[PDB]
Amino acid sequence: TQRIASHSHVKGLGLDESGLAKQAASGLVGQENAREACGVIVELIKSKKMAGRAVLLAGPPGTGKTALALAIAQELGSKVPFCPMVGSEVYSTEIKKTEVLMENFRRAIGLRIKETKEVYEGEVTELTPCETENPMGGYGKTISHVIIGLKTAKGTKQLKLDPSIFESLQKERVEAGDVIYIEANSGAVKRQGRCDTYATEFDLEAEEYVPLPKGDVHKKKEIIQDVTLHDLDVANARPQGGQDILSMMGQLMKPKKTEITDKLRGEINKVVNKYIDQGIAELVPGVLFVDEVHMLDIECFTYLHRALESSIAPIVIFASNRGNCVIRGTEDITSPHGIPLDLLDRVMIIRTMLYTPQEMKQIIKIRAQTEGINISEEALNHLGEIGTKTTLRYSVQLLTPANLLAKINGKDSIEKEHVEEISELFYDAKSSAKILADQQDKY
Amino acid sequence: TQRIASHSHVKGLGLDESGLAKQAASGLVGQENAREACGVIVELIKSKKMAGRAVLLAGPPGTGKTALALAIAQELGSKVPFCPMVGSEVYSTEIKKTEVLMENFRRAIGLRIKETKEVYEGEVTELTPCETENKTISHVIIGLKTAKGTKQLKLDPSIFESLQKERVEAGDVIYIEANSGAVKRQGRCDTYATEFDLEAEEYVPLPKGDVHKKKEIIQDVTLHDLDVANARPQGGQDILSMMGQLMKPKKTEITDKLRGEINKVVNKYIDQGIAELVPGVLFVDEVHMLDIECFTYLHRALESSIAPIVIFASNRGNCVIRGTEDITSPHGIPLDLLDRVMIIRTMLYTPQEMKQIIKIRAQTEGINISEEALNHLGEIGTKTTLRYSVQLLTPANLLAKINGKDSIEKEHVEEISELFYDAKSSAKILADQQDKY
Amino acid sequence: QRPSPSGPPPRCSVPGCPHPRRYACSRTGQALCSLQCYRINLQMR
Amino acid sequence: DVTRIERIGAHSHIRGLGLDDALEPRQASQGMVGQLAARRAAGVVLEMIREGKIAGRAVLIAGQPGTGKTAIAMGMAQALGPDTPFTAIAGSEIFSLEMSKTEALTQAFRRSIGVRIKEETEIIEGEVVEIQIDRPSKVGKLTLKTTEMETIYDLGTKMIESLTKDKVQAGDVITIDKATGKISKLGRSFTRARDYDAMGSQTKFVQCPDGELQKRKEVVHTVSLHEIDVINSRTQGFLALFSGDTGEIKSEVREQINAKVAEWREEGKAEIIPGVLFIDEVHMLDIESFSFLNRALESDMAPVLIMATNRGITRIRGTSYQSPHGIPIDLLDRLLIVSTTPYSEKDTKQILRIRCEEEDVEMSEDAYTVLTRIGLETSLRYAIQLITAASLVCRKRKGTEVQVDDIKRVYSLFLDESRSTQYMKEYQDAFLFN
Amino acid sequence: DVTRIERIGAHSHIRGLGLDDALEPRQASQGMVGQLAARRAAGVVLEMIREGKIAGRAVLIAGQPGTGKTAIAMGMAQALGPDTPFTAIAGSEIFSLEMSKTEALTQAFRRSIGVRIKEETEIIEGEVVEIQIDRPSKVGKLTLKTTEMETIYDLGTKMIESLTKDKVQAGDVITIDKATGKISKLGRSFTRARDYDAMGSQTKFVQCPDGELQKRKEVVHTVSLHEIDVINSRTQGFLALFSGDTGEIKSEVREQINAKVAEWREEGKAEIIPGVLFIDEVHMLDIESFSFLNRALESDMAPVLIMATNRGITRIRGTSYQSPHGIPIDLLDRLLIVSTTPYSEKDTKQILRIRCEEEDVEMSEDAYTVLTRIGLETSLRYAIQLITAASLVCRKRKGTEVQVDDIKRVYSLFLDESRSTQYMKEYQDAFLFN
Ligand SMILES: Nc1ncnc2c1ncn2[C@@H]1O[C@H](COP(=O)(O)OP(=O)(O)O)[C@@H](O)[C@H]1O
Ligand SMILES: Nc1ncnc2c1ncn2[C@@H]1O[C@H](COP(=O)(O)OP(=O)(O)O)[C@@H](O)[C@H]1O
Ligand SMILES: Nc1ncnc2c1ncn2[C@@H]1O[C@H](COP(=O)(O)OP(=O)(O)O)[C@@H](O)[C@H]1O
Ligand SMILES: Nc1ncnc2c1ncn2[C@@H]1O[C@H](COP(=O)(O)OP(=O)(O)O)[C@@H](O)[C@H]1O
Ligand SMILES: [Zn+2]
Secondary structure: OOOEOOOOOOOOOOEOOOOOEOOEEOOEEOOHHHHHHHHHHHHHHHHOOEOOOEEEEEOOOOOOHHHHHHHHHHHHOOOOOEEEEEHHHHOOOOOOHHHHHHHHHHHHOEEEEEEEEEEEEEEOOOEEOOOOOOOOOOOOOOOOOEEEEEEOOOOEEEEEEOOHHHHHHHHOOOOOOEEEEEEOOOOOEEEEEEEHHHHHOOOEOOOOEEOOOOOOOEEEEEEEEEEEHHHHHHHHHOOOOOOOHHHHHHHHOOOOOOOOOHHHHHHHHHHHHHHHHHOOEEEEOOEEEEEOHHHOOHHHHHHHHHHHOOOOOOEEEEEEOEOOEEOOOOOOOEEHHHOOHHHHHHOEEEEOOOOOHHHHHHHHHHHHHHHOOOEOHHHHHHHHHHHHHOOHHHHHHOHHHHHHHHHHHOOOOEOHHHHHHHHHHOEOHHHHHHHHHHOOOOO | OOOEOOOOOOOOOOEOOOOOEOOEEOOEEOOHHHHHHHHHHHHHHHHOOOOOOEEEEEOOOOOOHHHHHHHHHHHHOOOOOEEEEEOOOOOOOOOOHHHHHHHHHHHHOEEEEEEEEEEEEEEEEEEEEOOEOOOEOOOEEEEEEOOOOEEEEEEOHHHHHHHHHOOOOOOEEEEEEOOOOOEEEEEEEHHHHHOOOEOOOOEEOOOOOOOEEEEEEEEEEEHHHHHHHHHOOOOOOOHHHHHHHHOOOOOOOOOHHHHHHHHHHHHHHHHHOOEEEEOOEEEEEOHHHOOHHHHHHHHHHHHOOOOOEEEEEEOOOOEEOOOOOOOEEHHHOOHHHHHHOEEEEOOOOOHHHHHHHHHHHHHHOOOOEOHHHHHHHHHHHHHOOHHHHHHOHHHHHHHHHHHOOOOEOHHHHHHHHHHOEOHHHHHHHHHHOOOOO | OOOOOOOOOOOOOOOOOOOOOOEEEOOOOEEEOOHHHHHHHHHHO | OOOOOOOEOOOOOOOOOOEOOOOOEOOEEOOEEOOHHHHHHHHHHHHHHHHOOEOOOEEEEEEOOOOOHHHHHHHHHHHOOOOOOEEEEEOOOOOOOOOOHHHHHHHHHHHHOEEEEEEEEEEEEEEEEEEEEEOOOOEEEEEEEOOOOEEEEEEOHHHHHHHHHOOOOOOEEEEEEOOOOOEEEEEEOOOOOOOOOOOOOOOOOOOOOOOOOEEEEEEEEEEEHHHHHHHHHOOOOHHHHHHOOOOOOOHHHHHHHHHHHHHHHHHOOEEEEOOEEEEEOHHHOOHHHHHHHHHHOOOOOOOOEEEEEOOOOEEOOOOOOEEHHHOOHHHHHHOEEEEEOOOOHHHHHHHHHHHHHHOOOOOOOOHHHHHHHHHHHOOHHHHHHHHHHHHHHHHHOOOOOOOHHHHHHHHHHOEOHHHHHHHHHHOOOOOEOO | OOOOOOOOOOOOOOOOOOOOOOOOOOOEEOOEEOOHHHHHHHHHHHHHHHHOOEOOOEEEEEOOOOOOHHHHHHHHHHHHOOOOOEEEEEOOOOOOOOOOHHHHHHHHHHHOOEEEEEEEEEEEEEEEEEEEEEOOOOEEEEEEEOOOOEEEEEEOHHHHHHHHHOOOOOOEEEEEOOOOOOEEEEEEOHHHHOOOOOOOOOOOEOOOOOOOOEEEEEEEEEEEHHHHHHHHHOOOHHHHHHHOOOOOOOHHHHHHHHHHHHHHHHHOOOEEEOOEEEEEOOOOOOHHHHHHHHHHHHOOOOOEEEEEOOOOEOOOOOOOOOOEOOOOHHHHOOEEEEEOOOOOHHHHHHHHHHHHHHHOOOOOOOHHHHHHHHHHHOOHHHHHHHHHHHHHHHHHOOOOOOOHHHHHHHHHHOOOHHHHHHHHHHOOOOOOOO
C-alpha cells in the first residue's frame, strides 16, 4: 500500500458551511484563526478575481502551517494545480534564480484542451488498386482510387482512399496482415507491426508481432489533455522534432535549463488569450507554495516585488519558521521574520501559536490512530508530559519504537514501561544539547 | 534625422596651427592646458614612431575628460581606429579578464589590405560531373554562357560540393571565386520567367562583361577580426565548418603561438608592401574600476613593443585599490602603473565659462533662449552644477511649446527648476525623512 | 491479399507433450520444444 | 465568466497618467489621483518621448514607500500607446550566470529602441478548382476559382515541391505569394468539400473569396536591435531568440548592425522610434553597472531611461562608503531627480473610492471613515487588501453593501507587520536565530 | 596467496551485527563489544527499516569521537542484509561544479529507493554449428550446439537479413530472442577460433553454453529509481548514467516518475523496497541543505536517514551562530538522537583480543596491559596501528610471538599528536606561519 507520510493524516481544512472552522476536522485541531484565514484564501483561489496575492505564514516550529498549506491543495482538489517549492531550490548552478521563480510562476498556472481523434486500425485483409475505365489517348491507364481493407474483432470495414497515399504505402514496407496506424485528420500512415496471428509459421523472425487492435475500425473519441504553461514554455523553448541535424545533435547533447526570454512569454500569453477567446481551452490558476522563505537572497526578495506586481503572477504562499534574523546577502541588515520590510509590507502575515498540552495529547492520539497504534491511558498521560517538557514532534516520534518493541514483547498495546524504556534509550534534542556542554572540551 | 548625442557637438580639440588652444573652438571652451597638452599627443599618434605610451586624464567629474577623449577621436579622423572601453566590460563569464585586455590591442590596431581577386560569373548553360573508378567524381565540367561569349570550364569536386550545397541547377546565374574557393548563387535568369505564371524563385537580369575579371578590392580589417578568424574555423567550405557555423559562437582565448604567427604573416605582408598597417588608439574609461590583476597585466601590456597608445580616464581621487582590501592608492591606480602612465591635469570650469557651455548646448538642442534665461541658467548652474543647467534646457523648451512662446522665459526656467530637484537639496531632504526610509 | 492461414499448429515430437514447436532437430529430423522430450526422441530414433 | 490571461492587480487598473493637452496634471483622471508635481513631470517625460528628437537622457524618481512611484511608471506605460515600444526590467533580472551584467545592459538599451518596417506584397487568394502534376522535372497546372473571376496558372518545380510539401489537394482555399513563395491553406469550400472521398476527413471550412484573385497587401512589423543582432550574430539563429542560449555577442557585429540600421534610416525603408526603459529599485545594482551605464548612455542610439529609488543615503553594494540613494555622485548628478510628495488624508478616500468602480464593489459611506482611518494609520496597500478581503467576507454574508463588521472580521483575520513584530517579540525567544 | 580487490580495513574486520529475539546485544558479537543502548536502538530502527511502513524519518547519532558511530552504522547496514538499497555519502560529496547541491541531495534521496519487478522472458543462447541460406523469398537454417543437445532453426527472410547484415558466421556463440527479434553476438568458440592465425581487434572467447538451448523462464529484476530519471530525461540514459554527465534535472519529470511508479504500485506488479541513506560528519553542511531537509523529510516517499555528528557545538559555514551538533534548531527536533558512551579500559582488552584474530598474530597477556595503556591514555586507533606495526618488527626479530619490547619500539618510532604538538611548540618558530 501507500507509505505513511508525516502530513498524510491532513486531508484538508474541514470548513463548515457558515465559514467557521470546526475544532476537530480532517485531523486538524486548534488554530481556528489560521484555518479560517486560509478558508478565505481558498475562496480567493476559487474566485480567481485577483492575482499576485502573497500570503505569509509565521509562527514557532511545529505549529502546523505546512499542514495547513498542504491542506489547502487537498481542500481545493485535483482541478487546480499546486506547486510546493522550497527556497533551497532557488539557488542553482545552471539556471539563475529569477528564471527559477519565473518558471515556477509558469508551473503554477495550467491549461486544459479538449480534442477529438479519429483513427483507423486493424489487420489488413486486402489491398486493391481499384481501376476505373477511362481510356485516353494522352495517357493510357487510369487509377481512380485504392481500396484498403481492415479487419477487427468487432467488425470489418473497407476504405476508399486517394491513390496518392499508395505512393507512401509503396514507399514504406507494407505486408498482408500488418497492423497500421492511420489517422483521418492528419492523413499520415504509420506501420505498427506484424499481426500476432502469423507468428506461428516461423520459429524465428526479425519482425515483432503486435496483437490486433480490439475495437471498431473507426475510433472517434474526445479526450481532454491538461498542459501547463511551463510545459508550453519548454516545448516552445526547444524543438521536439528531430528531423534537423542541429535538432538531432542538440538532442544528443545534455539538456540544461536555459533562460527564457520575455518575448516567448508574451507570445504564449497572446495565443492563450486567443484560445480563451475561442473557448476551446480552459484556463485554471495555480497555487504556488514556498517554504523556508528566510533562505532567499536579497536579490530574490527585491525581484519578488516586480514579480508580484505583474498581473500574470499566481497566488503565492510563504512559510517562515524564523524570527528576527539577518537578511541573507547583507551582514549588518536585520529585519523581522527574516524578510525585508518592502516585501514584508506586501505579503499578508498570518500568526500561528504553539499548542497546549491537551492539543498535544489529541494530536498524539490522531497520529497513533493514523499509524494504527494503540496507547494506554497512563502511558498517554506520561507521553503528554514528555511532549510538554520538550516538544510535540519528539512525542510523536516516540510512538513507532514503542509499537515495534511492544509487538516484539507480545503486547498489542503500548505501556508506560515501553515508553519509559524508549524514553530512556533515546535522547531528546535539548537533553543531548545539555550533555554536549559538559564534554564540549573533549569534542 | 540623427538623434542628438551629448558629445555630438564636440568636433575636436579646437587647436590652431601653432599648437595653442583657442578660447572657444570646435565646440569646446576652456581647458587650454589640457587641449594644448593633447596637441602633442595627436602628433605622436600621427607620427606612429612610438608605442607603449599611456596618457592618464585626471579631473573632477563633469570636466570633459570623455569629451577630450572623443575630441581626440574626432581629431585623428575616421582612418585612425579608436576603441572605447569601460572598466566593467573586462569582466566576462566565457573568457578570462586578461584575454579581454589582450584582445583590445588587436582590436585597436587596424590593417588595410588590398586583395586581387579573379572572378568567374555568368549563366550556367550545362553542368555535368565526371565519373572515375575508385563511383567517385574526379572532375566537373561546367559551361558558362554570357552576352559576351560562352566558355566551358572545369571545376573541382569541392566546388561541386559547394554547388550542390547551394542547390545549383541548369539555367541559373552563379558567382565563383578562385582563391577563396567559396561559391555563391545570384539567382535564376529573367529570360525564363515567362514559362511559369507563378514561381517562388526571384529573377535577376543577365549580367554583362567578360566572364573572367581580375579586380582589386581594398578592405580594412582589424587584427582582432583576423585573430578570431584564425582562432576558430567559422568560415570555410568544409562540412565541419558548416557544423561549427551552426554551433553557437562562444568566446575563446587565443594562444600566443597564434598571435606570433599572425605577427609573422602580417610582417610578411608588410615586407611585400601589399598591406598597409595603421596604429590604433585604445581608450579606457572608469579605470579605477579595473582590478589590480588587470593592472598587473597592464604592466607587461604597456611595456610591450607592439602595444598601441592607450589613454585612461580617472574621475576620482585617493581610493582603495580593487581587490587589495587594505592599500589605498591615488586615482584608484596603484603606484606601479601610475608611475608609468602620463598624467594630465584638468581644472573645473569658471562661472563665466559655464554660461558659454550652456549657450552652445542650448543652440545645439535647437532652442532659442533669451539672455535673461541664459543669465539665470548660468547663475543656478554656478550655484549647483553645470550638468543640471544642461538638463534643464529641453523641458523648458517643452513648456515653451505648450504655452506657445517662441523662446524660453524666466517663468519656464523657474517652473522647471521648481519641478526638478538638485542632488544637494534632495540629499538634504533625505536627512529629515531618513528615519522613514 | 493475405493467404489462408494454416489451421493446425505445429506440435512436439513426443505426443504426450505436444506444444507449438520451439526448434527443429536435424539428427532426429523432428521438431521439439525442450531437451526433456529431446531425450525421448533421440532415444527412439 | 471567461477569464483572460490578465487579472486584476495593484498597478493594472491605471489606464494612463490623466493629463490634459496643456500637460497640466488633472486631479482625478485615467485611474490616477493626486501628486500633481510627479504627474506633471511624468507629462514632461511623456511629451519628451513623443517628441523623440533627443536621445541619451536619464530620469530618476524618488520618494517615500507607498507614494506611487511604480504607479506613475505604469501610468506613462499605459498612456504611451501600443505603437510605442516599452520595456520594464529589474536590477535582479540583468544578473545572470550565462552572460555578463554589462552585456545584459546592452541588451536592455538596444532592446528598448524599436524599429518599424513596412512591407508591401502581392498575394493570390482563391479557391482551388483543380490540381495537376506531371512527373517524368515535374510540371503541373493549378486552376482556381473566385466569384469575380476564374483563373488558371502554371506551377513550377519549386512551386510543386511547396504545394506537395503542404499536402494541397483540389477543393481547398489557399494563399500563394509570388515574390516570397509561401503557401498557406486557409480552409476548404463547403460545396466543393461536400462530396469527398470515403476517408472522411473533417477539419475546417472556409467560404469562397470574392474580388480580384491577386491583391496587394501591406503588413507592418517591428524588430528590435537586439533581435537583429542575435539573428545576424548566431548565423541563422532564429531559434536562439526564444531559446535565450545566445550570449556575449561580439561588439564588432553590433557596430556593423548600428551602421547598417543608420544606412536603412538614410534610405527611408525602415524607421527608428524611441523607447522607454523602466528600472525599479536600482539602488541594489552594482556600482560597475553604474560606471558602465554613465559612459554607455552617451551613445546616440541610447534611449532615454527612467529609474526609481526607494531609499536614500545608503552604501552601494561592493563599496563600504555611503552615497545618497545608493547611487554614485557621477550618476546621481548625471540624471535629474523627481521627488514624490506623500499622499494626504483627502486623497486616500478617493483612492479607496477608485476600487469601488474598478472592482465593482458597492461601498457604504460609513465604511470610508473607518477604512480611511486604517489608511492613515497603516499602509494604503493593506487598505486595498482590506477592501478585497472585505468584499470576500461581504459576499460570504451575501450583502450588497459593505458593513463595518466584515472589515473588523478581516482585520481580525490578518495582522499588520508591526503587530506580527510585536508578537514576534514575545515569541522571539522560541523563534530561530533571534 | 591471491589478493582480491578488497583488503583489510578499519571497519572491514566486522561482518554482521549479532542480536537476539529480545534485542539484547551480546557482550561480544561479530567483533563488536559495548554500546548496549546504541546497539539496541540500532536493532529497533533496523527492524523499522525492515518493516518500511512509514517514510521520512531521520536518526542522528551523538557521542564523543571514537565511540564507533561508523562501526554501529556499518554493523546495522550489514545486519540489514544484502540486496537492500544503501547509499552512504560524505558531507563534501554533494558539492559539485556541474550539479547543484539540491540536485545532489535530491538524487541522493532518489537513488536509495529500490523497486523489485517480475518479468518472464524466453532466450535462445548457444554456439552456432552451421549457417546456410538459399535465395531464389530466401529460406535458410542454422545449426546450433549445446552440451545437452544440438538443434537447427529455420529462419525467415528478414531474420536472415539481420545475420547477414551483422556478417554472422558459423562457429560463433550467439543469443537470439524470438519475441524481440534482436541478435546478440557473445563471441566465438575456442576450437573454432583457434584455426585463425591472428584475431581481429575486437574478439573474445566464450565457453560452449550448457543446459537448455531455448529457456523460457521468469526472472525477478531489481531496479533503482535513479536510473529511470536519466533514461526519461534524455534519449540515452545509460550513457549519462555511467558518465555522470546529467545534471539539473527538472522536477516535473520526477513528479511523472512518482505518478507512474504509484500506478505500478496500484497495479501490484512491482513492490518498492525501502532503503538507507547515511551521512557522516554532518556538522559541516550548508544551511540551504538544512532547509531542504525539511521538505525532504516531509515528502511522500523518502529513504530512512542515518546521520552522524562528531562535534557538540560548531558554527555552521556561511553564517555566524552557535547551535548544538552544528545543525539548526528547526531541524534539530526532526532527528532521533542516539547517545553513545566511551569504551572502558576493560573492554579495550577485549576488542584488542578481537583485533588480534584479524592479523592472526598472537599476543601475550602481558602485552595487552601496555597496548591497552596506550589505547587508554591515547587514541585507540593509534594502538590498533601499534599492534600491526609491531608484528612487522616481531618478524624482523624472527620471533613466534610479539613482546612488550615491540610495542615499546614502535611507540618510540611513532609519536602521538599531542607529542608532535609539543615538539612543534619547541621548533614552531622555525616552522612557517606559526
Ligand atoms: N493541528 C495539528 N493537528 C495534527 N497534526 C499536526 C498539527 N499541527 C502540526 N501537526 C503535525 O506536525 C508535523 C510537523 O509540522 P510542521 O510542518 O513542523 O509545522 P510548522 O510548519 O508550523 O512548523 C506535521 O507532520 C503534522 O502532521
Ligand atoms: N570645454 C568644454 N566645452 C564644451 N563642452 C564641454 C566642455 N567640457 C565638457 N563639456 C560637456 O559637458 C558634458 C559632461 O562632461 P563629462 O563627460 O561628464 O566630463 P568628464 O568626462 O570629465 O566627467 C559633456 O557632454 C561635454 O560635451
Ligand atoms: N496616484 C495614484 N492613484 C491611485 N492609486 C495609487 C496612486 N499611487 C499609489 N497608489 C496605490 O498605492 C498602492 C501602493 O503603492 P506603492 O507601489 O507602495 O507605491 P511606491 O511604489 O511609490 O512605494 C498601490 O496598490 C496603488 O494602487
Ligand atoms: N564497539 C566496537 N567494537 C569493535 N570495534 C569498534 C567498536 N567501536 C569502534 N570500533 C573501531 O574503531 C575504529 C574507529 O572508529 P571511528 O570511526 O573513529 O568511530 P567514530 O566514527 O564514532 O569516531 C573503527 O575502525 C572500528 O572498527
Ligand atoms: Zn516436448
